[PDB]
Amino acid sequence: KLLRELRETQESERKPPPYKHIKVNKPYGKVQIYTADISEIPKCNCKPTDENPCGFDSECLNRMLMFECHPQVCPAGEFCQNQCFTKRQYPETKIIKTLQRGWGLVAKRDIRKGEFVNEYVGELIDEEECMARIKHAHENDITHFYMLTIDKDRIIDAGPKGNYSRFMNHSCQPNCETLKWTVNGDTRVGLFAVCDIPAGTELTFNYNLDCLGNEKTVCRCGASNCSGFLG
Ligand SMILES: C[S@@+](CC[C@H](N)C(=O)[O-])C[C@H]1O[C@@H](n2cnc3c(N)ncnc32)[C@H](O)[C@@H]1O
Ligand SMILES: [Zn+2]
Numbered sequence: 663k664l665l666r667e668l669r670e671t672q673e674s675e676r677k678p679p680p681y682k683h684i685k686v687n688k689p690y691g692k693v694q695i696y697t698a699d700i701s702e703i704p705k706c707n708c709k710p711t712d713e714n715p716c717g718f719d720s721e722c723l724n725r726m727l728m729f730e731c732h733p734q735v736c737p738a739g740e741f742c743q744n745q746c747f748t749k750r751q752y753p754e755t756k757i758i759k760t761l762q763r764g765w766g767l768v769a770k771r772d773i774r775k776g777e778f779v780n781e782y783v784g785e786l787i788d789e790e791e792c793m794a795r796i797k798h799a800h801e802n803d804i805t806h807f808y809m810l811t812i813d814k815d816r817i818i819d820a821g822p823k824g825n826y827s828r829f830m831n832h833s834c835q836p837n838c839e840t841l842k843w844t845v846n847g848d849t850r851v852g853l854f855a856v857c858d859i860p861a862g863t864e865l866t867f868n869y870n871l872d873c874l875g876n877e878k879t880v881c882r883c884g885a886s887n888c889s890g891f892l893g
């Protein structure tokens with residue numbers, strides 16, 4: 663069978679196929695977008711003279727509630743360490759080729775538990791649009807999906823456009839998790855470490871929680887607790 667011969671040839675591409683490398687979510691069609699003026703953004707009670715103001719180990723009111731400080735609002739001023747999403751403060755990573763799971767992402771330094779790894783960025787779409795894309799993909803034998811739910815009727819599609827977090831694969835035993843933060847009046851999806859991650863270890867997360875279209879995809883994460891699918 664010609665189709666099995668096609669898979670068998672399984673050659674060596676030196677680069678992932680094209681996508682637009684974007685900094686920030688980009689809305690499409692009739693999706694809802696939210697913004698806040700400087701005045702609406704919450705203000706913590708950190709001082710600029712604090713050990714690590716608005717830092718990971720700090721008692722920051724904004725940090726605790728998963729709100730990002732604004733530069734003009736924060737009482738710590740420029741010494742605010744709670745600006746990860748806006749400043750795009752990602753550990754350096756590298757795209758690698760895996761054997762069974764296509765392209766993947768590893769980091770270039772050690773990452774500590776709870777640390778900001780990346781923002782899941784992409785084309786912002788509503789649910790009707792997402793369902794149409796999935797239906798079209800399934801009809802056209804497309805097996806790669808990059809859909810992640812923000813809330814009902816807001817889905818990030820990192821397929822056409824995204825950043826490096828689009829290369830993060832699914833594991834049944836992940837070292838990263840998604841957490842929904844409030845940044846400048848809207849919801850943003852961060853990737854954070856669930857454990858200490860040594861440099862050169864593949865960065866992964868559990869797609870069951872928030873990703874769409876993967877119900878038919880067989881899992882090859884290799885973990886001892888592998889359930890066998892991505893969704
Ligand atoms: C968000 S992309 C991850 C990066 C992708 N491997 C690439 O090369 O662009 C998700 C897709 O990667 C593949 N994938 C990711 N994790 C996988 C896993 N654990 N087992 C099998 N395929 C996986 C599937 O094609 C899935 O639709
Ligand atoms: Zn603070």
Ligand SMILES: [Zn+2]
Pocket residue numbers: 706708715716724731732736737738742743744
């Ligand atoms: Zn702050």
Ligand SMILES: [Zn+2]
Pocket residue numbers: 833834881882883884885887888889890891
């Ligand atoms: Zn698995």
